[PDB]
Amino acid sequence: SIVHPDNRWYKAWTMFILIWALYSSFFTPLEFGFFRGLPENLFILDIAGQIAFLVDIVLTFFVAYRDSRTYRMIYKRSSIALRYLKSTFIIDLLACMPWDIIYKAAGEKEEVRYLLLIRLYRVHRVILFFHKMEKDIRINYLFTRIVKLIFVELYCTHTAACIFYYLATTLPASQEGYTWIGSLKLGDYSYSKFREIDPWTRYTTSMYFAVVTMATVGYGDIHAVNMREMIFAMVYISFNMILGAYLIGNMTALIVKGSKTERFRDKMADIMRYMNRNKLGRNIRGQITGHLRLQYESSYTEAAVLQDIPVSIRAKIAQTLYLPYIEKVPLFRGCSSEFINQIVIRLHEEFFLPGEVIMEQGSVVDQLYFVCHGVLEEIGVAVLQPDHSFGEISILCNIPQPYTVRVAELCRILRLDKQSFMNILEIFFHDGRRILNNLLEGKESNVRIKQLESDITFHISKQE
Amino acid sequence: SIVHPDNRWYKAWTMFILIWALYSSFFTPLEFGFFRGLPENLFILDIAGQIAFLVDIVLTFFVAYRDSRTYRMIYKRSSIALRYLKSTFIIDLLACMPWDIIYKAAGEKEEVRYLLLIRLYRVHRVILFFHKMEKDIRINYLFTRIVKLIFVELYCTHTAACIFYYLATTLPASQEGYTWIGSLKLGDYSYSKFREIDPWTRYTTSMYFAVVTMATVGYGDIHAVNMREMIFAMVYISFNMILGAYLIGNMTALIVKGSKTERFRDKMADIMRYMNRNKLGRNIRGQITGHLRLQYESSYTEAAVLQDIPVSIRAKIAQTLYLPYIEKVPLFRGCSSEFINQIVIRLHEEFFLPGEVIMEQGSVVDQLYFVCHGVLEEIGISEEIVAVLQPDHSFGEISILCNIPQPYTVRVAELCRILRLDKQSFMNILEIFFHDGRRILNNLLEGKE
Amino acid sequence: SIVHPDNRWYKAWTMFILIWALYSSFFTPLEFGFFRGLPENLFILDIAGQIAFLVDIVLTFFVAYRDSRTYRMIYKRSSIALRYLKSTFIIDLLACMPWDIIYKAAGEKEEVRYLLLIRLYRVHRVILFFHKMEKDIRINYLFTRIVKLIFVELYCTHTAACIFYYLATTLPASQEGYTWIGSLKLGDYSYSKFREIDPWTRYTTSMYFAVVTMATVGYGDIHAVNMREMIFAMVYISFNMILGAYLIGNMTALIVKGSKTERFRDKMADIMRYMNRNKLGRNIRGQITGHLRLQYESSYTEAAVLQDIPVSIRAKIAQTLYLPYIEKVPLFRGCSSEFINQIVIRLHEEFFLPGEVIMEQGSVVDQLYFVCHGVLEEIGISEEIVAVLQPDHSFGEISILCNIPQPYTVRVAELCRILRLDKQSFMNILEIFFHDGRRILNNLLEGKE
Amino acid sequence: SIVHPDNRWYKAWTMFILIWALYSSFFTPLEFGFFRGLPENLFILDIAGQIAFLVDIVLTFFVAYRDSRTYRMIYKRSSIALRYLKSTFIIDLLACMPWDIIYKAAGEKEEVRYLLLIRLYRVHRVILFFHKMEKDIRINYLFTRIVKLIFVELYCTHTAACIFYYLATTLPASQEGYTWIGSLKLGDYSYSKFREIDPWTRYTTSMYFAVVTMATVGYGDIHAVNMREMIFAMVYISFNMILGAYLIGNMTALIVKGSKTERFRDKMADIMRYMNRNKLGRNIRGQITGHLRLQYESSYTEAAVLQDIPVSIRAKIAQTLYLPYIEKVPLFRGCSSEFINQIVIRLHEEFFLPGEVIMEQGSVVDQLYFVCHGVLEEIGVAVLQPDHSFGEISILCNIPQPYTVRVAELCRILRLDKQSFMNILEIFFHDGRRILNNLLEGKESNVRIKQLESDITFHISKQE
């Protein structure tokens, strides 16, 4: 009866065990502290949680585990237990035994309740969820990080408050003077008989010490008074420093890493340092600024995405997006299926902004271009509406293109090198003659369209 | 009456809200704390402050808003409010209700004043301005950020001290002992009856707690002495723990990206490693470091960062810069604009320190130069200064055009900003414009008779 | 007898110095502090410790040293010592002199013991090991650094507490009041006669001061009460101020460069921005995110970082990886090694999730694939599984060679690591080896009868 | 009598004024604190410093200033004063008047001595030197940064100690109880009559407060007791936070920026993550590792340096380094002056490590290569000692080179694209025929040397 880890019912169960793991993270320290055994009522609540994890450790041999390296989903029930018995099985079993009851049976000895600290490991269940919720891309990174540190602190000071109160209670009532709380004289309130004041006061005071110690404030109203309380202040203060450096380090890691907007900062302020050097006249300055800025972000992110991912998906997504207009674009009309599908998968997007000047006179256009969307204005001569193409003039005639390319609005341009263009023809020479024969048809307007026919036969010599 | 956000009157109006939000973001904590109701005097200020934001929410339906995703300005008088009614609406409206008045009439209940804590949001107006001041770079970035960090703190330690002094006043007069301020014994000054001490030194003492706790100093004169001051102190300390990391995260974000001595040190790090590897001459080191000093002293450390702008607009920049210098040169006297324009596109920018030898007598020269600013001396080897190159002069023309080695060792006497043109750049333009090339030869003959 | 540093005996010998430097870097502060001379028992340990380093400086002339600049190992028995005599020499030699013995004989002068503070250098041995442990990465970097930042700060407070307790003992017994430890009133425990209290709780109390000052907590139970403890406390606090920044500078250096969830979030940041911009289909999002989940769950996020290694050695890597899989494929039965070797060079690595459709029936295929690990099912459309592709199988051969569309829709039932070969890559090798191409056609005919 | 700023005598004078500025930085606060006027002896020391700066402000109108933007060294005496009278003249003059003497003349009023705080600006003189010493590349960056923060903190706490003691003394002796030092009870030492204890104790105590406050330790033994001492603790604690963030920020800025060695970290540990993914067999692994690593650092730093700097210097340094062997290298022998000087200035260095495999069979060598140093072993065939060249076979014959290039040791290779090679010939066609005529001579060994002659005439058709 193996069950998939992604099964909704088992996913709900893990969330159910999370709440029963969030309870025992913030209630096990209370059992190590103020409570020397569950009086009457917490028994049913503790045993319910224990059998909840006892059935959970039972319901782990049928849970389909999957190795990260192999990335193989394993249905083998017997092979599931190989990882569990070595990873967390030993720790988990010691966290399910009703150690409080066996504490009550072994003469109420205090040695056994020290081993109850293994139940503190259950907090790792909710930390794993924070890792998973970090893995989930839905929510903001700042929100989960701040919440994670708010939690990895709330828990640390809470477990350092229920233990510090224990270190005061490990001495008898007679020697309560040599404790951090028995000698407390906060204002006119004297914590004389701490063992019998209201439980809420002796905990909030304990949490006060942990929080004013974690943040390295240290008022000194509450402080270690004994060697055992000093030794714990040794570990806790040193540990908080490492966590404090980690929290500080993580916070500035997020700020430094969050440089997409700091890339904006870079561009703008480097132009700004150049201009603190020169106070350049701002008209052309800001115009070219806008242009470069937007074109850059566009092309850069385009490369980034089109670069990763297996080729088949890039082939398919390009077909979904580039193929429609390429099928019946003026420069590429009457082609075949494999011919259009070959070019698209290796088309490079080079978007150009409204008003951007792409090329000018005397430029050898070695990269074929196609207008996916928007109107183009070749004010060198030609107006290219959406679903148009250009740039062939310098590919086959080899004379540099005398067409100053100017964008009217939102000219989406696909770049295809002239080396890539001639590579397409040779692979499918049959369709290469068809597109050239279609190219020899009515589109004979001017030097880039009429003289096109004379240099179209140049590839005819190549393919014949 | 839709009003554009760029309107000078409306923009100055938001400053009027800003100056009154600054007053109301540092008076709301005081009203929640030291004051159990404003008695007589600043009541006029309270009413005017409550209507200042009330007349703002009224006119928020007159403003024109822009959608960032579409980047299109919207003047619609019906689609404006959908963003407003689902972003703040209630928090702005409830911040205008005179909570002082309703408290003073509804049995002076203490719980009513707690709703006045939502007026602390009005600091969001002055943090939006800092965001706007961040967007328009203008001022130095190390200045605005430090001012921003010295504000989220100055506002916190001002609202965490007025709130903390409120906690002490929650207890009755007879229970002054169980308070953070009633049990102070600072030196010979005892805060026995704190409520009868002047509010001035009460706020300073209360703020003394806030800043020695904020900066994690924590002297220990003032600490929580209750269960309410205890719980709040943990909350305020925890809040500063994540806010304090933010402040030093931003400060180190500026130093990391700061264009300062950090980056030039790397420039000499690899080059000095190479000349020892390349075992070049000692005189070579003096020149390159001199140029590097010529390039690091003035921090002339941008050229490929400026070339980030495409050539399809860097020409526009070159024609804005280098075209006016080229036109008045006697060599190009009468040259066509397109011929001159193409020359400017291919020009380059370099500096030369005075005392250096740009070219040697009898040497082959493959570069063209034009004087923009500064004086050069054409010295012919004794060494005699054959000619003086004032700004707007051309030198090196003989070697490129006439394939004749330079007979004058021109030396820099004062630093000059000199443009540069290459040989094959010059030939290509010459072939296109044969008429311009012939006129240049005539100009050179007439200019050096 | 020159000994190579890589010798197992000598390397284990330096650990013997390391374990005895660890003992002597946490006992020198104790000897400078609590002990005014080691009375009887650990005298044997003191003498052995002083000769342990003395036999080390003796044998430092037997070791073989390497010069990093030349990267050439030197066995010379005369040029070895020039580095030694000008780097440490004196500090190592003076660390071996039995300062305990000379103190006990020269009128038990207090000033003599101050020269024993130079034995604190012996912690440099155990910080060099951490540097060496840093060089050989091996263990997780977040582990070694934290252990390092738990050593410069477990040596500094241990030596700033034993030194601080020494300052209290400088004053006479009658002047216990003007001390940091003589005037303690921790609870009902009064440190009246601190010298008569057990050294155990004296060190713990003294270390209690060191760590609440190190971590900038500063409770205020223990503070400087003198002019000597006052001056030292400012020195120790200032030293931690620049050392504390170093510790959090290193910790944030690891998180910045940590290859963790920080970087994948950017990968979905731009792509998710594009499909909405490209208005692609919803089914497209499920696939790409699935592959991205296939690539982020396993953190298979390196391919261009692996392509950083030149192709002139990435082939060597490919032949180490992909050559053994290619050889036993029935299609290449009897193919020459060079023909097989060239195929491996052009191979590529991809993953496919089970349940996906790699190719569709009747579709044009331009890619070649070979099974390395995992099982694939050749399903022909009802849907019938025509064939089962065990590891070491070839599929898609028909479409590329015979220009015939695939008649089977092969679907992934279990995740497979499949190599990839392109068409024009296949044609180019085929033309070079015509004999191999003919045999492949014979193998394909014989393999699919 | 204008003097150059780089003149050694004036450079010594600035260092002399630095010491007299380092004295008045650490002694002006003492004049604001314990000293209510110079008793007898410090008069001659103070006035000597004042006339030292009085002659210094005099000797600034003849000091040749140079604007950063223009980078022009100005010899004009009258134009020197334009910057000084606007930059620091007003501040400086108020720092030269003997304010202590005028304090003694105006009824010993304490208002005038407040304005003595302007003398604290003299610390900017030594901060400028730290900027200059940072500008100097001789010394380590970590050393100067740590020293700079050590100073800018020694000074900050020193000036916050001499002011805090002032805030205690601004109250009369009768009300000394309401001060931070009059109420001090450190241990059994009572600071009862602070105004008459030894000056060294009341200063070290004052410096104790500043340092335990700056580092955010805050023991609380010494603390503010009055409103004026609280208000200064407001400014000082807040100011130290900004400086503390700056010191922390600078320290981690140095660590993050110091990534040349962290680039090593990157390469090695990315290979390490790939291998934690696969435990790849290490033989070939580490061999290819070494190769890639060293070749990468070499080529990368080479590009970096050869990339900046005006062209003339790169032309000259390449002549000093590349020209010697290029003059008489086997593939380039019997050439002319301009021909060899043209190629060198646009030669790109591509160093290859001992044992590195550069190219293989079937590779179209479109980049000419020359062995500057080291022995090459073309185990495809040819052994190339230092001062040798190869790679021409695929440039003119166009057949891909069947020469597997293998390095014996330290093969320094200069890269020259075949497009650059043919560009060289056309510019100096006269010398292009001479090198080809020399190429047609005895070097006719094999297909890349003997068949060379047949394809040498291909350029003869181009140039004729």
Q: Print burial letters for B103-138: b (CB count within 10 Å at least 16), e (below 16).
A: beeeeeeeebbeebebbbbbbebbeebeeeeeeeee
> Which of A110, A117, A88 lies closest to A24, judged by CA?
A117
Q: Hey, is D235 helix, strand or coil? A: helix
In chain D, breaks (C-N over 2.5 A) are found after 380
State whether B245 and A256 contact (CB < 8 Å). no
A306-331 as b/e: b if 16+ CB within 10 A: bebbbebebbebbeebbeebbeebeb
User: Which residues of chain C lie closer than 8 angstroms to A256, CB-CB?
Assistant: 256
Closest by alpha carbon to C397, among C345, C446, C355?
C446
Amino acid present at D65: Y
Is residue A443 marked as binding?
no
Question: B179 in helix, strand or coil?
Answer: coil
Residue B346 CA to residue B216 CA, distance in Å, equals 60
Which of C15, C36, C37, C34 has its CA nearest to residue C26? C34
**Which residue in chain D has the smallest CA separation from B291?**
D309
**Orientation of helix D418-427 relative to helix D429-439, angle to 10°:** 120
Other residues' Cβ atoms within 10 Å of the Cβ of residue A193: 10
- Stated as kind and residue range, the H or E segment containing B271 is helix B261-278
Letter for the amino acid at D129?
F
> What is the C-alpha separation between B56 and B47, in angstroms, rounded?
14
Helix spans in A322-450 (H): 323-327, 337-345, 393-396, 418-427, 429-439
Query: How far apart are alpha carbons D400 and D379 in whole angstroms?
Result: 16
Asked if residue B224 lies in contact with residue A207, where contact means CB atoms within 8 angstroms, the answer is no
D440 labeled part of a ligand binding site? yes
Q: Residues A213, C187: contact at Cβ < 8 Å?
A: no
Residue D250 one-letter amino acid: N
Q: How far apart are CA A61 and CA A52, in angstroms?
A: 16
How far is A341 from D388, CA to CA, in rounded Å? Answer: 49
A229 marked as part of a ligand binding site = no
- Specify burial of residue C307 (Cβ count, 10 A radius: 0-12, 13-18, 19+): exposed
**Angle formed by the axes of helices D199-214 and D227-257, nearest 10°:** 60
Q: Is C38 helix (H, G, I), strand (E, B) or coil?
A: coil
Smallest CA-to-CA distance from B236 within B208, B211, B199 is with B211
Q: For the sheet containing D405-409, what is the strand order?
A: D382-384, D375-378, D405-409
Which element (helix H / strand E) includes D13?
helix D8-25
Instruction: Determine which helix (DSSP H) or strand (DSSP E) holds B204, and give its type and residue range.
Output: helix B199-214
Query: Does the distance separating the beta carbons of A251 and B245 come in below 8 Å?
Result: yes
Which two tokens mark A377? Answer: 């204005």
If you write DSSP's letter for every residue of D315-367 in order, what string do you get?
Answer: HHHHHHHTHHHHHTBTTB-S--HHHHHHHHHT-EE--B-TT-B---TTB---E
Concatenate the DSSP letters of all residues of C124-137 into one string: HHHHHHHHHHHHS-
Residue C156 marked ligand-binding: no
Does the distance separating the beta carbons of C242 and D208 come in below 8 Å? Answer: no
Q: Comparing C-alpha atoms, which of B372, B431, B429, B423 is closest to residue B398?
A: B423
Q: Dihedral sign, CA of A144, A145, A149, A155?
A: positive
The reply to whether C396 sits in an annotated binding site is yes
CA-closest candidate to residue B145, choices B253, B24, B54: B253
- A212 in Cβ contact with A218 (< 8 Å): yes
The Cα–Cα gap between B138 and B251 comes to: 19
Query: What tokens were used for C195?
Result: 């010298």
CA neighbours within 13 Å on the CB side: how many for B173?
4
Q: What angle do CA C203, C209, C215 make, to 5 degrees?
A: 125
In 3-state terms, what secondary structure has residue B296? helix
Length of chain D counted residue by residue: 464
Which one-letter DSSP state was computed for residue C418?
Answer: E
The C-alpha atoms of residue B228 and residue B215 are separated, in whole angstroms, by: 22
Distance linking the first and last C-alpha atoms of chain B? 74
Tell me how many degrees the CA angle B173-B178-B179 measures, rounded to the nearest 5: 80
The CA-based dihedral angle spanning residues D300, D302, D305, D311, taken in that order and rounded to the nearest 10 degrees: -130
Amino acid residing at D256:
V
User: What's the rounded Cα separation, in Å, for the pair C348 and B56?
Assistant: 64
What is the radius of gyration, based on Cα positions, of chain C? 36
Please tell me which chains touch B, using 3 or more CB pairs under 8 Å as the contact test: A, C, D
Asked if B214 and B164 count as a contact pair (C-beta separation under 8 A), the reply is no
Helices (H), A74-198: 77-87, 89-94, 99-105, 110-114, 123-135, 141-169
Determine which helix (DSSP H) or strand (DSSP E) holds B373, and give its type and residue range.
strand B367-373
As a whole number of angstroms, the distance between CA D25 and CA D2 comes to 30
Residue with tokens 């907090």: A123
**Residues in binding site of B for a nucleoside 3',5'-cyclic phosphate:** 331-447
Please answer yes or no on whether A218 and B213 come within 8 Å at the CB atom.
no
Residues with Cβ < 8 Å from B221, sequence gap 6 or more? Answer: B184, B186, B208, D220, D223, D224
CB atoms within 10 A of CB C24: 24
> Among D234, D230, D214, which Cα is nearest to D178's?
D230
Long-range contacts: D142-150, Cβ < 8 Å, 24+? Answer: D142/D254, D145/D250, D145/D251, D145/D254, D146/C242, D149/C242, D149/D247, D149/D250, D149/D251, D150/C238, D150/C242
| Other Cβ atoms within 10 Å of D388 Cβ, number | 21
Does residue D375 sit in helix, strand or coil? strand
In three-state secondary structure terms, C223 is coil
Cα Rg of chain B, angstroms: 36
- Taking a C-beta distance cutoff of 8 angstroms, is the pair C213, D217 a contact? yes
8 Å CB contact between A390 and A369: yes
Residue with the two structure tokens 């696969």: D278
Please enumerate in sequence order all residues whose Cβ is within 8 A of that of A347, keeping only pairs 6 or more positions apart, or say none: A318, A322, A370, A414, A415, A416
**Which three-class secondary structure state does DSSP give residue B260?**
coil
Interhelix angle D337-345/D311-321, nearest 10 degrees: 110
CB D180 within 8 A of CB D224: yes
Q: Which of A69, A216, A252 has its CB closest to that of D277?
A: A69
Count of CA atoms in the C-beta half-sphere (13 A) of D88: 14
* Binary contact (C230, D267; C-beta < 8 A): no
- Whole-angstrom Cα distance, residue A96 to residue A88? 13
What CA–CA distance (Å, rounded) separates B373 from D382?
56
From chain B, pick out residues whose CB is under 8 angstroms from the CB of C216: 216
Of C216, C219, C220, the CB nearest to B216: C216
Distance from CA of B430 to the nearest CA of A (A): 15
Contacts of C368 (CB under 8 A, 6+ apart): C394, C396, C397, C400, C420, C421, C422, C423, C426
B446 alpha-carbon distance from chain centroid: 53
- CA distances to C330, C340, C424 from C435, rounded to whole Å, are 17, 13, 18
C-chain CB neighbours of B219 within 8 Å are 220
Distance CA D133, CA D116 (A): 29
CB atoms within 10 A of CB C324: 12
* Residues B423/B399, Cβ–Cβ less than 8 Å: no
Cβ atoms of D119 and D28 closer than 8 Å: yes
Residues 6+ apart with CB under 8 A from D394: D363, D364, D365, D366, D400, D401, D418
Please report where in the chains the tokens 């973001």 appear, as a residue.
B25
Helix (H, G, I), strand (E, B) or coil at D146: helix
Let me know if D261 is exposed, middle or buried by CB neighbors in 10 A (0-12, 13-18, 19+). exposed
Q: Which two tokens stand for residue B231?
A: 């719980």
- Does residue A162 contact residue A113 with C-beta atoms inside 8 Å? no
Two tokens, residue D433? 């025929």
Residue whose pair of structure tokens reads 């402080």 in the numeric block: A223
The amino acid present at C320, given as its one-letter code, is T
Q: Which of C189, C217, C297 lies closest to A237 in CB terms?
A: C217
Other Cβ atoms within 10 Å of C92 Cβ, number: 19
Sign of dihedral through CA atoms B220, B224, B230, B234?
negative
d(CA C254, CA B196): 55
Using CA coordinates, name the residue in chain A closest to C153. Answer: A238
CA–CA dist D181, D224 (Å, integer): 9
Resolution (A): 3.4
What Å distances lie between residue D140 and D50, D134, D136, D137, D149, CA to CA?
35, 9, 10, 8, 15
